[PDB]
Write a protein that binds this ligand. Structure first.
Ligand SMILES: Cc1ncccc1N[C@@H](C)c1cnc2ccsc2c1
Length: 116
């Protein structure tokens, strides 16, 4: 509270580390369904069903332009990518499988990088 400061982690490396994690995401062979925005004019239903579309290139732009206040808001957008994927795609499909794989891949890198 007021004048009662909690010790908090050094956050000076977070921007660089998040960029590093995102690069690893982008270069994963199963990243292809998530590299670019889903084309709202070619994919029926997507615009109406998915209220907050997100993809790696949008995340990269926001990261590079100071639009994440902290690492937690960055993680929310990454997870949003895979939550959207589950909403629109069957688990037993190429894209569906891709999503589960990429989520698992992210969460380990997240733990290994920041949960010291
Ligand atoms: C992640 C996702 N969810 C729902 C719909 C699309 C997509 N990916 C886009 C890139 C996409 C857009 N078009 C195609 C055509 C064959 S796979 C594929 C993938």
């Amino acid at each position: 509270s007021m004048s009662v400061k909690k010790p908090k982690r050094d956050d000076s490396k977070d921007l660089a580390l998040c960029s590093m994690i995102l690069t690893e995401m982008e270069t994963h062979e199963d990243a292809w369904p998530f590299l670019l925005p889903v084309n709202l004019k070619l994919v029926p239903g997507y615009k109406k069903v998915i209220k907050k579309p997100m993809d790696f290139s949008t995340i990269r732009e926001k990261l590079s332009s100071g639009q994440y206040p902290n690492l937690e808001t960055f993680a929310l957008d990454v997870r949003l990518v895979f939550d959207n994927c589950e909403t629109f795609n069957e688990d037993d499909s190429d894209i569906g499988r891709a999503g589960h794989n990429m989520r698992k891949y992210f969460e380990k890198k997240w733990t290994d990088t920041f949960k010291v």
